Scaffold this active site. Structure first.
Site, PDB file in Angstrom:
ATOM      1  N   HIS A 226       0.772  -1.204   0.000  1.00 52.80           N
ATOM      2  CA  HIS A 226       0.000   0.000   0.000  1.00 52.80           C
ATOM      3  C   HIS A 226       0.823   1.283   0.000  1.00 52.80           C
ATOM      4  N   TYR A 230       1.346   5.309  -2.518  1.00 55.58           N
ATOM      5  CA  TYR A 230       1.588   6.671  -2.067  1.00 55.58           C
ATOM      6  C   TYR A 230       2.978   7.080  -2.455  1.00 55.58           C
ATOM      7  N   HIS A 377     -10.722   1.431 -10.443  1.00 57.73           N
ATOM      8  CA  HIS A 377     -10.230   2.325  -9.384  1.00 57.73           C
ATOM      9  C   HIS A 377      -8.848   2.898  -9.679  1.00 57.73           C
ATOM     10  N   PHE A 378      -7.884   2.045 -10.034  1.00 60.94           N
ATOM     11  CA  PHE A 378      -6.498   2.514 -10.079  1.00 60.94           C
ATOM     12  C   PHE A 378      -5.982   3.103 -11.386  1.00 60.94           C
ATOM     13  N   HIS A 379      -6.699   2.919 -12.483  1.00 58.25           N
ATOM     14  CA  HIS A 379      -6.316   3.624 -13.701  1.00 58.25           C
ATOM     15  C   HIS A 379      -6.661   5.113 -13.626  1.00 58.25           C
ATOM     16  N   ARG A 442     -10.968  -9.662 -12.446  1.00 55.15           N
ATOM     17  CA  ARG A 442      -9.779  -9.084 -13.034  1.00 55.15           C
ATOM     18  C   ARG A 442      -8.685 -10.141 -13.158  1.00 55.15           C
ATOM     19  N   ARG A 443      -7.664  -9.827 -13.958  1.00 59.01           N
ATOM     20  CA  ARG A 443      -6.565 -10.750 -14.206  1.00 59.01           C
ATOM     21  C   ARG A 443      -7.052 -11.967 -14.972  1.00 59.01           C
TER      22      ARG A 443
HETATM   23  C1  HAS Z   1      -1.242   5.832  -6.761  1.00 61.70           C
HETATM   24  C2  HAS Z   1      -2.299   5.110  -7.086  1.00 61.70           C
HETATM   25  C3  HAS Z   1      -3.370   4.903  -6.094  1.00 61.70           C
HETATM   26  C4  HAS Z   1      -4.072   5.893  -5.271  1.00 61.70           C
HETATM   27  C5  HAS Z   1      -3.885   7.382  -5.188  1.00 61.70           C
HETATM   28  C6  HAS Z   1      -5.028   5.028  -4.520  1.00 61.70           C
HETATM   29  C7  HAS Z   1      -5.985   5.573  -3.530  1.00 61.70           C
HETATM   30  C8  HAS Z   1      -6.703   4.834  -2.469  1.00 61.70           C
HETATM   31  N1  HAS Z   1      -6.835   3.498  -2.519  1.00 61.70           N
HETATM   32 FE1  HAS Z   1      -6.127   2.187  -3.974  1.00 61.70          FE
HETATM   33  N2  HAS Z   1      -7.069   0.568  -3.024  1.00 61.70           N
HETATM   34  C9  HAS Z   1      -7.735   0.601  -1.848  1.00 61.70           C
HETATM   35  C10 HAS Z   1      -7.920   1.835  -1.052  1.00 61.70           C
HETATM   36  C11 HAS Z   1      -7.533   3.220  -1.411  1.00 61.70           C
HETATM   37  C12 HAS Z   1      -7.848   4.354  -0.657  1.00 61.70           C
HETATM   38  C13 HAS Z   1      -8.622   4.423   0.635  1.00 61.70           C
HETATM   39  C14 HAS Z   1      -7.305   5.425  -1.351  1.00 61.70           C
HETATM   40  C15 HAS Z   1      -7.381   6.856  -0.953  1.00 61.70           C
HETATM   41  O1  HAS Z   1      -6.053   7.353  -0.767  1.00 61.70           O
HETATM   42  C16 HAS Z   1      -8.093   7.697  -2.024  1.00 61.70           C
HETATM   43  C17 HAS Z   1      -8.299   9.118  -1.525  1.00 61.70           C
HETATM   44  C18 HAS Z   1      -8.612  10.021  -2.699  1.00 61.70           C
HETATM   45  C19 HAS Z   1      -9.523  11.013  -2.636  1.00 61.70           C
HETATM   46  C20 HAS Z   1     -10.280  11.255  -1.365  1.00 61.70           C
HETATM   47  C21 HAS Z   1      -9.796  11.875  -3.855  1.00 61.70           C
HETATM   48  C22 HAS Z   1      -9.253  13.297  -3.695  1.00 61.70           C
HETATM   49  C23 HAS Z   1      -9.429  14.071  -4.990  1.00 61.70           C
HETATM   50  C24 HAS Z   1      -8.638  15.111  -5.367  1.00 61.70           C
HETATM   51  C25 HAS Z   1      -7.483  15.582  -4.527  1.00 61.70           C
HETATM   52  C26 HAS Z   1      -8.882  15.813  -6.685  1.00 61.70           C
HETATM   53  C27 HAS Z   1      -9.787  17.046  -6.548  1.00 61.70           C
HETATM   54  C28 HAS Z   1      -9.767  17.733  -7.895  1.00 61.70           C
HETATM   55  C29 HAS Z   1      -9.424  19.028  -8.065  1.00 61.70           C
HETATM   56  C30 HAS Z   1      -9.026  19.885  -6.887  1.00 61.70           C
HETATM   57  C31 HAS Z   1      -9.401  19.603  -9.460  1.00 61.70           C
HETATM   58  C32 HAS Z   1     -10.532  20.563  -9.767  1.00 61.70           C
HETATM   59  C33 HAS Z   1     -10.180  21.145 -11.128  1.00 61.70           C
HETATM   60  C34 HAS Z   1     -10.913  22.087 -11.757  1.00 61.70           C
HETATM   61  C35 HAS Z   1     -10.451  22.594 -13.104  1.00 61.70           C
HETATM   62  C36 HAS Z   1     -12.178  22.653 -11.160  1.00 61.70           C
HETATM   63  C37 HAS Z   1      -8.225  -0.643  -1.494  1.00 61.70           C
HETATM   64  C38 HAS Z   1      -9.011  -1.013  -0.307  1.00 61.70           C
HETATM   65  O2  HAS Z   1      -8.925  -0.303   0.691  1.00 61.70           O
HETATM   66  C39 HAS Z   1      -7.831  -1.575  -2.539  1.00 61.70           C
HETATM   67  C40 HAS Z   1      -8.104  -3.053  -2.601  1.00 61.70           C
HETATM   68  C41 HAS Z   1      -9.048  -3.453  -3.729  1.00 61.70           C
HETATM   69  C42 HAS Z   1      -9.119  -4.974  -3.745  1.00 61.70           C
HETATM   70  O3  HAS Z   1     -10.125  -5.524  -3.233  1.00 61.70           O
HETATM   71  O4  HAS Z   1      -8.175  -5.631  -4.251  1.00 61.70           O
HETATM   72  C43 HAS Z   1      -7.133  -0.734  -3.393  1.00 61.70           C
HETATM   73  C44 HAS Z   1      -6.510  -1.191  -4.644  1.00 61.70           C
HETATM   74  C45 HAS Z   1      -5.468  -0.495  -5.426  1.00 61.70           C
HETATM   75  C46 HAS Z   1      -4.628  -1.207  -6.434  1.00 61.70           C
HETATM   76  C47 HAS Z   1      -4.633  -2.650  -6.866  1.00 61.70           C
HETATM   77  C48 HAS Z   1      -3.594  -3.402  -6.059  1.00 61.70           C
HETATM   78  C49 HAS Z   1      -3.624  -4.835  -6.532  1.00 61.70           C
HETATM   79  O5  HAS Z   1      -3.353  -5.093  -7.736  1.00 61.70           O
HETATM   80  O6  HAS Z   1      -3.937  -5.718  -5.713  1.00 61.70           O
HETATM   81  C50 HAS Z   1      -3.769  -0.144  -6.937  1.00 61.70           C
HETATM   82  C51 HAS Z   1      -2.700  -0.249  -7.982  1.00 61.70           C
HETATM   83  C52 HAS Z   1      -4.223   1.030  -6.160  1.00 61.70           C
HETATM   84  C53 HAS Z   1      -3.595   2.336  -6.353  1.00 61.70           C
HETATM   85  C54 HAS Z   1      -3.998   3.611  -5.744  1.00 61.70           C
HETATM   86  N3  HAS Z   1      -4.979   3.706  -4.825  1.00 61.70           N
HETATM   87  N4  HAS Z   1      -5.215   0.819  -5.279  1.00 61.70           N
HETATM   88  C1  HEM Z   2      -2.109   2.411 -22.620  1.00 62.51           C
HETATM   89  C2  HEM Z   2      -2.990   2.814 -21.673  1.00 62.51           C
HETATM   90  C3  HEM Z   2      -3.484   1.752 -20.665  1.00 62.51           C
HETATM   91  C4  HEM Z   2      -4.515   0.934 -20.851  1.00 62.51           C
HETATM   92  C5  HEM Z   2      -5.419   0.885 -22.097  1.00 62.51           C
HETATM   93  C6  HEM Z   2      -4.623   0.094 -19.680  1.00 62.51           C
HETATM   94  C7  HEM Z   2      -5.563  -0.886 -19.492  1.00 62.51           C
HETATM   95  C8  HEM Z   2      -5.499  -1.875 -18.545  1.00 62.51           C
HETATM   96  C9  HEM Z   2      -6.466  -2.932 -18.353  1.00 62.51           C
HETATM   97  C10 HEM Z   2      -7.753  -3.143 -19.179  1.00 62.51           C
HETATM   98  C11 HEM Z   2      -6.062  -3.691 -17.341  1.00 62.51           C
HETATM   99  C12 HEM Z   2      -6.801  -4.944 -16.793  1.00 62.51           C
HETATM  100  C13 HEM Z   2      -6.066  -6.205 -17.268  1.00 62.51           C
HETATM  101  C14 HEM Z   2      -6.291  -7.420 -16.387  1.00 62.51           C
HETATM  102  O1  HEM Z   2      -6.801  -7.315 -15.235  1.00 62.51           O
HETATM  103  O2  HEM Z   2      -5.933  -8.522 -16.872  1.00 62.51           O
HETATM  104  C15 HEM Z   2      -4.809  -3.122 -16.865  1.00 62.51           C
HETATM  105  C16 HEM Z   2      -4.033  -3.582 -15.831  1.00 62.51           C
HETATM  106  C17 HEM Z   2      -3.122  -2.846 -15.129  1.00 62.51           C
HETATM  107  N1  HEM Z   2      -2.560  -1.642 -15.518  1.00 62.51           N
HETATM  108 FE1  HEM Z   2      -3.090  -0.574 -17.139  1.00 62.51          FE
HETATM  109  N2  HEM Z   2      -3.616   0.435 -18.794  1.00 62.51           N
HETATM  110  C18 HEM Z   2      -2.897   1.462 -19.370  1.00 62.51           C
HETATM  111  C19 HEM Z   2      -1.814   2.097 -18.811  1.00 62.51           C
HETATM  112  C20 HEM Z   2      -1.331   1.866 -17.554  1.00 62.51           C
HETATM  113  C21 HEM Z   2      -0.440   2.729 -16.809  1.00 62.51           C
HETATM  114  C22 HEM Z   2       0.140   4.081 -17.286  1.00 62.51           C
HETATM  115  C23 HEM Z   2      -0.216   2.137 -15.642  1.00 62.51           C
HETATM  116  C24 HEM Z   2       0.668   2.640 -14.482  1.00 62.51           C
HETATM  117  C25 HEM Z   2       1.318   3.821 -14.535  1.00 62.51           C
HETATM  118  C26 HEM Z   2      -0.958   0.893 -15.624  1.00 62.51           C
HETATM  119  C27 HEM Z   2      -0.978  -0.011 -14.595  1.00 62.51           C
HETATM  120  C28 HEM Z   2      -1.687  -1.188 -14.542  1.00 62.51           C
HETATM  121  C29 HEM Z   2      -1.644  -2.139 -13.445  1.00 62.51           C
HETATM  122  C30 HEM Z   2      -0.813  -2.058 -12.140  1.00 62.51           C
HETATM  123  C31 HEM Z   2      -2.608  -3.240 -13.852  1.00 62.51           C
HETATM  124  C32 HEM Z   2      -2.984  -4.511 -13.086  1.00 62.51           C
HETATM  125  C33 HEM Z   2      -2.001  -5.588 -13.469  1.00 62.51           C
HETATM  126  C34 HEM Z   2      -2.294  -6.740 -12.570  1.00 62.51           C
HETATM  127  O3  HEM Z   2      -3.487  -6.914 -12.198  1.00 62.51           O
HETATM  128  O4  HEM Z   2      -1.318  -7.465 -12.243  1.00 62.51           O
HETATM  129  N3  HEM Z   2      -1.635   0.754 -16.803  1.00 62.51           N
HETATM  130  N4  HEM Z   2      -4.492  -2.017 -17.617  1.00 62.51           N
HETATM  131 CU   LIG Z   3      -3.887   0.200  -0.781  1.00 69.70          CU
END
Ligand code: HAS
Ligand code: HEM
Ligand SMILES: [Cu+2]
Ligand code: CUA
Ligand SMILES: [Xe]
Ligand SMILES: [Xe]
Ligand SMILES: [Xe]
Lengths: 555, 166, 33
Positions: A226, A230, A377-379, A442-443
């Site tokens: 996790h 971050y 969620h994570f894309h 997934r996967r």
């Molecule tokens: C860096 C990438 C990631 C971020 C960031 C992220 C955020 C969270 N995640 Fe996550 N996540 C989980 C919980 C959270 C929580 C509580 C947050 C929090 O940190 C999110 C807080 C975010 C917010 C509260 C949004 C704030 C919004 C902002 C700051 C933008 C405002 C926009 C503005 C200001 C612009 C306005 C613009 C104008 C022009 C008006 C949980 C469970 O609790 C799973 C397990 C799922 C499962 O069952 O396998 C999980 C699964 C994943 C996986 C899959 C891992 C795997 O393959 O097994 C990845 C890669 C991932 C990445 C990321 N995750 N997460």
């Molecule tokens: C070319 C644009 C992209 C497309 C169209 C795309 C699409 C996808 C899709 C459909 C999956 C699901 C595949 C599966 O569960 O078998 C996947 C998996 C994933 N992608 Fe992307 N993705 C893109 C770019 C990226 C980028 C930029 C990142 C990170 C910077 C990323 C990180 C991941 C990760 C961590 C997984 C999960 C792999 C796993 O489950 O082991 N992808 N992507």
């Molecule tokens: Cu996490």
């Protein structure tokens, strides 16, 4: 042949990280579209098998997609940004010997692990869950790759200690503060994976032992698993807090809010991992609840941030002649991709967050766990915000590093790339969140069973559409990045330009607040007690009852 | 202006913060609720229950698929399932409605998932460990189990079945 | 100048999205319970 390399050799070192980083992103991202189609129920793989004869299955593709994009690209970006930025702000030089040692470790470590991946000897995915056993050179490769960050931690601690010595009693400058609690957080975090690797994965794939306990393996994995997201996020946050408000023509509206955010990340980033293990046996339900609560807390830093950045963007917008309640959105510089890329990414980050907060709520997880929802969620999180920020940052960082300016043709090509990448990512998110509500796991190579999930009829259309949009985007990006990296246009003076750091509105109440937060030694100790309190009780009990199982290869 | 903007922002910022915690605490409450109800049954057994994955199918509860189901209470039925490289045992699992089915699931090889379409049964199944979950089906019938954790080349094809008899 | 009306608008959009998503899925949990 560059003096600019000679007073700023840290510029070159930084460029090599970024270059290696974006290359990994390109190679990784190629599999993206194919996978989007797969989830659109279209089987594109014999085509890709023909282009890339070395690709053996869908799952090797996914392993390559996961590893090069989420592990390689992101770690290399972090290292460049969270070393160079604190270097330019203190106007000091990074210990150059070490810096280059970390680049080679990362480069050698990548190459060592690239081989077994490319030779289909480690089709285990980027989570590499035992007993699925990969080639030893993959495990060693990654180990060294991840260990490269330990040199970076040091370099930036050094830089900070040296600035401390030269300014006794002054408050650590913001960016440095961010970088400092950044790398300390990562250190606490990294012990999990490092322990898994030193205790289990390395001896195992060297044959020294025959078995590995899957439950401890993945429990230790998600210790680092996790905070590592971050570790991906914060380099983007550093950029958004302290470089975007300037690119937007306004100011960061609060220094100590930015400090508090990053402080809370040091605090709550690591002891939450059980939120990835809600569906695991042998981990007490209480401990899960505890971790579910600590995970909602970890959301606070991103809630705070959401306001702070918005305030600054609205501040920027008003300064620009921001009209009423929405006039300031139109007032921003939508003609600059360095601004457009991160802001759009921040939009996608809104659905992104709600999905995550859903996921974190213990019992609600069972709805979505391991379904196409999580990729949904994570894309929005890493492949949108982080990637778009990074791409966007090409527009200012790349000039500052190389002295190559950016043409109007290129600046416009970028805006196209950025808007498409965004639109492509949005479209997909709906497809995957939708599909995920319909139980598509997934996967999975789901195109290879065309009749299994007919109920995902329409989301499959979206997933298809996204694959097309994002493939275009990717091709245009490869085009534009290489056009910037392949021109001989060099103004060495824009290379000696300062980074467009943004200035910060300061208040009276700042001081005492900021002071308390600069107590880094104390906050680090608190950070560590939390990890021990969160993990300790369970880790001891799992270690009391080790049950190693033999390894398997099933690809 | 600007210094005015600083006070306004930092004010509205504390507000937002307090409102956000308040809203998180509301979620904390509602989750606590489901923990107390019948639906908390899908939460995996806390206890470590170690088994050998190389002997699971020569000796023990998971050996004979014809011994898989075993009535253990007045309305309780323990179902010993086995998730293995590309399939489930027993196929199908045959269970009664409105009975509290206790699943006790394991693997002889790699990690698989046990996702019962239509339900909240979503548990990871780990070699050498028993994953114990309870669930009372109310709606009768043909539930399909999906492996949702990458297990190998035919993962996308690892399906199973539940037959909850009316 | 004054009250950050647009910041509010942004965090409001965010809050609604969090609710639609959370309550939304809290719904399905029971519907599958
Ligand atoms: C860096 C990438 C990631 C971020 C960031 C992220 C955020 C969270 N995640 Fe996550 N996540 C989980 C919980 C959270 C929580 C509580 C947050 C929090 O940190 C999110 C807080 C975010 C917010 C509260 C949004 C704030 C919004 C902002 C700051 C933008 C405002 C926009 C503005 C200001 C612009 C306005 C613009 C104008 C022009 C008006 C949980 C469970 O609790 C799973 C397990 C799922 C499962 O069952 O396998 C999980 C699964 C994943 C996986 C899959 C891992 C795997 O393959 O097994 C990845 C890669 C991932 C990445 C990321 N995750 N997460
Ligand atoms: C070319 C644009 C992209 C497309 C169209 C795309 C699409 C996808 C899709 C459909 C999956 C699901 C595949 C599966 O569960 O078998 C996947 C998996 C994933 N992608 Fe992307 N993705 C893109 C770019 C990226 C980028 C930029 C990142 C990170 C910077 C990323 C990180 C991941 C990760 C961590 C997984 C999960 C792999 C796993 O489950 O082991 N992808 N992507
Ligand atoms: Cu996490
Ligand atoms: Cu068993 Cu995937
Ligand atoms: Xe790696
Ligand atoms: Xe590793
Ligand atoms: Xe991860």
């Amino acid at each position: 042949i560059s003096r600019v390399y000679e007073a700023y050799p840290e510029k070159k070192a930084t460029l090599y990280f970024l270059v290696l980083g974006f290359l990994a992103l390109i190679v990784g991202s190629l599999f993206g579209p194919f996978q989007a189609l797969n989830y659109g129920n279209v089987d594109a793989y014999p085509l890709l098998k023909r282009l890339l004869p070395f690709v053996q299955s869908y799952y090797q593709g996914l392993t390559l997609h996961g590893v090069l994009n989420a592990i390689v690209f992101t770690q290399l970006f972090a290292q460049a940004i969270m070393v160079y930025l604190p270097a330019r702000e203190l106007n000091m030089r990074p210990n150059m010997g070490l810096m280059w040692l970390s680049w080679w470790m990362a480069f050698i470590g990548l190459v060592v692990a690239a081989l077994p991946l490319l030779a289909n000897e480690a089709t285990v995915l980027y989570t590499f869950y035992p007993p699925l056993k990969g080639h030893w050179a993959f495990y060693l490769g990654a180990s060294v790759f991840v260990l490269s960050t330990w040199v970076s931690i040091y370099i930036v601690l050094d830089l900070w200690r040296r600035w401390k010595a030269a300014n006794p009693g002054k408050v650590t400058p913001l960016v440095t503060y961010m970088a400092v609690v950044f790398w300390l957080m990562w250190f606490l975090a990294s012990l999990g994976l490092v322990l898994e690797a030193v205790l289990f994965l390395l001896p195992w794939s060297f044959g020294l032992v025959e078995g590995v306990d899957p439950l401890v393996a993945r429990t230790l994995f998600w210790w680092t698993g996790h905070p590592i997201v971050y570790f991906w996020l914060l380099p983007a946050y550093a950029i958004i807090y302290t470089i975007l408000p300037k690119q937007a023509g306004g100011k960061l509206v609060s220094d100590p809010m930015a400090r508090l955010a990053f402080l809370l990340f040091l605090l709550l980033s690591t002891p939450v991992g059980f939120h990835h293990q809600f569906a695991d046996p042998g981990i007490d339900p209480t401990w899960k609840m505890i971790h579910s609560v600590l995970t909602l807390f970890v959301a606070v830093p991103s809630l705070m941030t959401a306001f702070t950045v918005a305030a600054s963007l609205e501040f920027a917008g008003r300064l620009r002649g921001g009209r009423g309640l929405f006039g300031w959105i139109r007032a921003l510089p939508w003609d600059n991709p360095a601004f457009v890329a991160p802001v759009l990414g921040l939009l996608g980050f809104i659905p992104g967050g709600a999905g995550g907060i859903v996921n974190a709520s213990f019992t609600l997880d069972y709805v979505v766990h391991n379904t196409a929802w999580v990729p949904g969620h994570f894309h929005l999180q890493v492949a949108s915000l982080v990637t778009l920020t990074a791409m966007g940052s090409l527009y200012w960082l790349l000039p500052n590093l190389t002295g190559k300016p950016i043409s109007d043709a290129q600046r416009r090509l970028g805006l196209a790339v950025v808007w498409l990448w965004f639109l492509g990512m949005m479209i997909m998110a709906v497809g995957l969140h939708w599909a995920g509500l319909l139980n598509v796991p997934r996967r999975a190579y789901i195109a290879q069973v065309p009749d299994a999930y007919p109920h995902a009829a329409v989301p499959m259309v979206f997933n298809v559409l996204a694959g097309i949009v994002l493939l275009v985007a990717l091709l245009l990006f490869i085009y534009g990045l290489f056009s910037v990296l392949l021109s001989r246009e060099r103004k060495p003076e824009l290379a000696e330009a300062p980074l467009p750091f943004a200035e910060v509105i300061s208040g009276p109440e700042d001081r005492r607040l900021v002071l308390a937060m600069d107590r880094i030694g104390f906050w680090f100790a608190v950070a560590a007690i939390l990890v021990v309190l969160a993990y300790g009780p369970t880790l001891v009990q799992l270690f009391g009852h080790l049950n190693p199982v033999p390894g398997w290869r099933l690809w | 202006d600007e210094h005015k903007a600083h006070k306004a922002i930092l004010a509205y910022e504390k507000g937002w913060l307090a409102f956000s915690l308040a809203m998180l605490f509301v979620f904390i409450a509602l989750i606590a609720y489901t923990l107390a109800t019948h639906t908390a049954g899908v939460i995996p057994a806390g206890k470590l229950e170690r088994v050998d994955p190389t002997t699971v199918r020569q000796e023990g509860p998971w050996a004979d698929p014809a011994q898989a189901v075993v009535q253990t209470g007045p309305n309780q039925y323990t179902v010993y399932v086995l998730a293995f490289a590309f399939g489930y045992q027993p196929n199908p699992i045959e269970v009664p409605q409105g009975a509290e089915i206790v699943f006790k699931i394991t693997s002889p090889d790699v990690i698989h998932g046990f996702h019962v379409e239509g339900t909240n049964i979503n548990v990871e199944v780990l070699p050498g460990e028993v994953s114990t979950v309870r669930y009372t089906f109310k709606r009768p019938g043909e539930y399909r189990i999906i492996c949702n954790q990458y297990c190998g080349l035919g993962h996308q094809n690892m399906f199973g079945t539940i037959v909850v008899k009316e | 100048e004054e009250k950050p009306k647009g910041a509010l608008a942004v965090i409001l959009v965010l809050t609604l999205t969090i609710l639609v998503f959370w309550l939304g899925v809290y719904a399905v949990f029971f519907a599958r319970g």
